[PDB]
């Protein structure tokens, strides 16, 4: 304390910087380092300009104009710096070295970076870059430096770094430059500024930049950033604990939790065998240096660091994926980048036997806040990159990425054990205009940093094993647009398109496979059993082909591919060159080197202008040439439907299935119903059913309804916002998609056992209560307030300003019918004149709202509408005018009522009619009067009086009162005495009518209580009359 634990933590990061006082030099990883180390320092010691009248300290680095030269010079001595306090470096101590190193500080104090400097250009080398190196010197050469040295210098790094003010990395590099500073000048309260510089950076977000519960890492608003930023905000974060852990300035924020759990969700998905998956790392794929093995080294260092500062279920699962990955690293893409520290921690964890390797990781996880998904399986990794209105296709800036054109088109990509096949030069080498999994305009581009106007990019997935994706491809700048989807089971994944159009003029394609090759290009390529030529050069248009077999570099990389049908697929094995200059052309990573590397491209052609053209496909990993024939023969998958309408695929040895819905109408394939847009994936078993559902377009504010085909017995289990509306016959549901981001919503059946009950009914949840209405839709933002006299004690402030605002909600309504639409209104002094619409058709005339008079509120009736399917319908109300006495267009919205109609309840029965009537004795029909209902009328013939009876039983919808009323055919020799009973619920009733009279017209012969079904009848009895007797109808009609 006030020196003693500052030495502690100094000592600390030092020895992270250097690697400790002492290490086992016989390590040839360590030995490697060290050597590394002296000759670098070498370098910069002998390029250095060492005289007093000197203006900078390497020509490299140039002062005056550009702020680089300060990281650029700092480095420099940084490095000299390392050599210098590097045990076993040949470097170490050496006075010369020493004197030069602090001489150029003192220099740097002098001459240009220093408290009250001038900050010329670019800020960042000032604020971040020159500061963290000056920090690492200082770090390491403190014991030789006097008190005055160590105060001018951080007095420097105060001066450019006083605060935290910035967000994500930035804020990063500040804390940790503000920490380091802090724990150098011994000065509490700067450390603390430090430690508490990072909090902002913890939470999850559920939009825009950070880390989601998901998984997702988003960056630059609209990107899928895992492997770049996230990747940094991780290191810097996990370094940060791991210095300031057990001190007086730890993190103590509960948000550092998460920074464990990132490791399970956000990285540990994407790391294949040592591989970061480039379809997170953004625009950084474009970087040479910065290739998928050497990507994931930060990744792996980071998780060390997290596992040292862990709990201890935690620090054992990362140390055994570490391991894993480690011992998997045969030539030492790890060992050889990393700090001797790191060396030293890599090496022990290896070497340690109560640490075992985690093995091969099997799970599906989709992310849905980046557009993405991971399939892993035994034997291969698949990932899945796309985009949406919500995320970027691929990023561009600074001249870097220029080649990203079709990075999210739908790519895909397979890793197996070629751990290879996207470093070694893939990116700079590889026709960036056939990226796999793609539907592209042949060799076109694409603008950079854009959505698409498609929000149908998601999936869901089931047992955490099994997932179907989708993605509505439409390029920017261009009329092409697909339906794509995937369906990723235990080792087979369908590709699926249809409804693929365009009308830019160019042939269209889908790119099934671009593989890199041996040194040789020679990987055997079998077609239809049959080997085709290896040579580079080779190029055909295959017709009818079955399946294909492309054997893999490496024991465990061989790709088959099957083609339900048969297709028509381009093939080309080529050897390519090219620099990653086309990639990027940044002044830091500009390279312009040719390399040649060898390729295998499958495509499909659709042709110009197609106007509905499809594909499928079925990658097989790790399969021998036979097995994939074998596979072709007798398909472990099904495609049920590829349409523009769904897309589904079942696995009929696992029995589940996948099921893409494109349209928001009532759609059905297999044995599954959706009334919406969905992601859908169903396992059967003997005992059980389970579905899985998602709303991928993410902008659903209402419900998805779900049929199943099949008979449950009842309920094994359900998440929160499934409502089960039916076991048998039939399964039904509807899930609460509202606010979902994509995510999936699970419901399993039972399937034997005693029925249960079937769920009652689900009546019209009256009133529907504005306060609480998701709203689909607005022009002005309506607020809640507080009203005794209102529904629910709240009523809806709508606020808006002029003609055409409207505001649109979502009402789930529960039963078809056609229903009285009504809205309870308070009473304010400024309302204005609405237009009610239902699912863009107006119903009723618009209603001036405005009043006067005394009274609270009113009921307005907006009108009629038929809604002949249940499920979530917009109810849109639009400002239309005001009237004079108004403040203005506002409202005062309590709550909807949807009322029954005579159209759904009123019920006539007429005596043929093949239900309700049943007669006893004999009757005879004519035409003969026309005193009306149907064609036809019955009589007695005045005969067999008290003998006979007509009786109509009507099927009473709800129940409720009916007024019950009858018409016949009047004359002159009918009866005048007609007995006429009525059953109803309570009793029976019975009256004469007199035949002879009010015929043609209904006669209201009485009002009770009907009960819902046909335990109620009405029926003429012939007893005692006096003339004929008619039957004809009867018609009741509910009240109110
Ligand atoms: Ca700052
Ligand atoms: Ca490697
Ligand atoms: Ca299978
Ligand atoms: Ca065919
Ligand atoms: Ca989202
Ligand atoms: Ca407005
Ligand atoms: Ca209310
Ligand atoms: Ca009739
Ligand atoms: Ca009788
Ligand atoms: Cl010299
Ligand atoms: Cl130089
Ligand atoms: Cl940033
Ligand atoms: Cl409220």
Redesign the pocket.
């Known amino acids: 304390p006030r020196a003693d634990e500052f030495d502690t933590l100094r000592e600390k990061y030092k020895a992270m910087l250097n690697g400790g006082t002492t290490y086992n030099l016989s390590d040839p990883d360590i030995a490697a380092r060290v050597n590394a180390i002296t000759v670098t320092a070498q370098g910069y010691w002998d390029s250095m300009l060492k005289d007093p009248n000197r203006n900078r300290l390497w020509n490299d680095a140039p002062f005056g104009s550009d702020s680089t030269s300060i990281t650029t010079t700092y480095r420099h001595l940084y490095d000299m710096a390392l050599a210098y306090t590097t045990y076993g470096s040949s470097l170490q101590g050496n006075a010369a070295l020493k004197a030069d190193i602090i001489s150029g500080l003192d220099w740097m104090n002098a001459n240009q970076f220093y408290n009250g400097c001038s900050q010329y250009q670019n800020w960042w080398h000032w604020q971040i870059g020159g500061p963290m190196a000056l920090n690492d010197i200082v770090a390491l050469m403190y014991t030789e430096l006097t008190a005055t040295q160590i105060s001018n210098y951080m007095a420097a790094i105060y001066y450019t770094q006083a605060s935290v003010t910035m967000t994500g990395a930035n804020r990063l590099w500040e804390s940790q430059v503000i920490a380091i500073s802090g724990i150098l000048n011994k000065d509490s309260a700067r450390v603390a500024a430090g430690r508490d510089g990072i909090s902002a950076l913890l939470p999850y977000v559920a939009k825009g930049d950070g880390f989601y519960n998901d998984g997702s890492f988003v960056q630059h608003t609209y990107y899928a950033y895992n492997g770049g930023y996230g990747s940094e905000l991780l290191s810097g974060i996990a370094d940060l604990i791991f210095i300031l852990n057990g001190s007086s300035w730890q993190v103590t924020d509960p948000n550092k939790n998460n920074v464990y759990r990132w490791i399970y969700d956000s990285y540990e998905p994407f790391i294949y065998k040592g591989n970061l998956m480039d379809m997170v790392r953004g625009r950084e794929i474009s970087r040479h240096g910065l290739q998928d093995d050497k990507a994931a080294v930060t990744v792996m260092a980071s998780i060390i660091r997290l596992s040292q500062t862990a709990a201890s279920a935690d620090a054992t699962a990362f140390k055994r994926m570490v391991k894993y990955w480690l011992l998997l690293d045969t030539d030492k893409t790890f060992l050889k980048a990393v700090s001797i520290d790191l060396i030293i921690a890599a090496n022990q964890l290896v070497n340690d036997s109560t640490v075992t390797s985690r093995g091969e990781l099997v799970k599906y996880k989709q992310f849905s806040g980046m557009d993405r998904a991971v399939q892993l399986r035994p034997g291969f990794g698949f990932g899945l990159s796309m985009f949406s209105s919500r995320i970027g296709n691929y990023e561009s800036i600074n001249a870097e990425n220029n080649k990203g054109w079709h990075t999210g088109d739908g790519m895909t990509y397979l890793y197996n054990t070629d751990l290879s096949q996207f470093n070694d030069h893939f990116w700079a080498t590889v026709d960036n205009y056939r990226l796999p999994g793609t539907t592209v305009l042949q060799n076109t581009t694409q603008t950079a940093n854009s959505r698409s106007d498609k929000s149908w990019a998601g999936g869901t997935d089931i047992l955490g094993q099994y997932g179907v994706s989708g993605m509505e491809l439409h390029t920017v700048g261009k009329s092409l647009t697909a339906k794509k989807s995937w369906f990723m089971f235990d080792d087979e994944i369908v590709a699926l398109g249809s409804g693929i159009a365009s009308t830019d003029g160019i042939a269209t394609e889908t790119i099934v496979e671009n593989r890199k090759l041996n040194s040789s290009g020679n990987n055997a390529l079998i077609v239809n059993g049959t080997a085709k030529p290896g040579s580079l050069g080779w190029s055909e248009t295959m017709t009818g082909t079955n399946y294909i077999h492309l054997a893999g570099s490496v024991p465990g990389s061989d790709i088959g591919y099957y083609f339900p049908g048969g297709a028509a697929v381009k093939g080309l094995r080529e050897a390519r060159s090219g620099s990653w200059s086309s990639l990027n052309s940044s002044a830091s990573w500009k390279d312009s080197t040719l390399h040649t590397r060898n390729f295998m491209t499958l495509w499909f052609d659709h042709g110009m202008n197609p106007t509905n053209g499809s594909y499928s496909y079925v990658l097989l990993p790790n399969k021998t040439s036979s097995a994939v024939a074998s596979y072709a023969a007798t398909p472990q998958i099904s495609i049920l439907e590829n349409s523009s309408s769904a897309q589904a695929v079942k696995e009929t040895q696992l029995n589940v299935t996948g099921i893409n819905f494109w349209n928001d109408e009532p759609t059905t394939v297999g044995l599954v119903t959706s009334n919406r847009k969905a992601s859908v994936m169903t396992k059967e078993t003997a005992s059980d059913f389970e579905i899985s559902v998602s709303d991928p377009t993410q902008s659903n504010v209402g419900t998805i309804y779900i049929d199943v085909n099949k008979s449950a017995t009842g309920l094994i289990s359900k998440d929160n916002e499934i409502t089960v509306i039916q076991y048998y016959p039939t399964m039904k549901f509807k899930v609460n998609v509202n606010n979902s981001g994509g995510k999936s919503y699970k419901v399993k059946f039972s399937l034997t056992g005693t029925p249960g009950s079937n769920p009652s009914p689900i009546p019209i949840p009256n009133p529907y209560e504005a306060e609480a209405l998701p709203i689909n839709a607005l022009?002005?933002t309506p607020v809640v307030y507080n009203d005794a006299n209102a529904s629910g004690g709240k009523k809806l402030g709508f606020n808006?300003?002029?003609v055409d605002?409207y505001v649109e909600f979502s009402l789930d309504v529960t039963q078809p019918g056609t229903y009285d639409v009504k809205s309870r209104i308070m009473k304010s002094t400024n309302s204005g004149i609405y237009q009610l619409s239902i699912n863009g058709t107006n119903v009723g005339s618009a209603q001036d709202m405005f009043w006067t008079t005394s009274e609270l509120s009113k009921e307005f009736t907006m009108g009629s509408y038929s809604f002949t399917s249940p499920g979530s319908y917009l109810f849109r109300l639009k400002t239309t005018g005001k009237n004079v006495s108004s403040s203005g267009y506002k409202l005062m919205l309590d709550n909807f009522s949807l009322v029954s109609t005579g159209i759904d309840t009123t019920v006539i029965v007429d005596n043929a009619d093949a239900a309700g009537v049943t007669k006893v004795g004999t009757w005879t029909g004519t035409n003969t009067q026309t005193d009306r209902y149907g064609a036809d009328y019955i009589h007695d013939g005045n005969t067999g009086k008290g003998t006979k009876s007509v009786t109509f039983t009507p099927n009473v919808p709800i129940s409720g009162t009916y007024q019950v009323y009858m018409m016949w055919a009047a004359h002159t020799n009918r009866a005048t005495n007609v007995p006429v009973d009525v059953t109803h619920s309570g009793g029976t009733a019975t009256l004469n009518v007199n035949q002879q009279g009010n015929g043609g017209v209904w006669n209201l012969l009485g009002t009770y209580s009907f009960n819902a079904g046909s335990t109620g009848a009405i029926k003429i009895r012939t007893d005692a009359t006096n003339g004929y007797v008619v039957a004809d109808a009867v018609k009741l009609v509910k009240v109110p």
Request: charged letters at 35%; aromatic letters at 0%.
């Open positions: 022009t002005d808006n300003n002029a605002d």
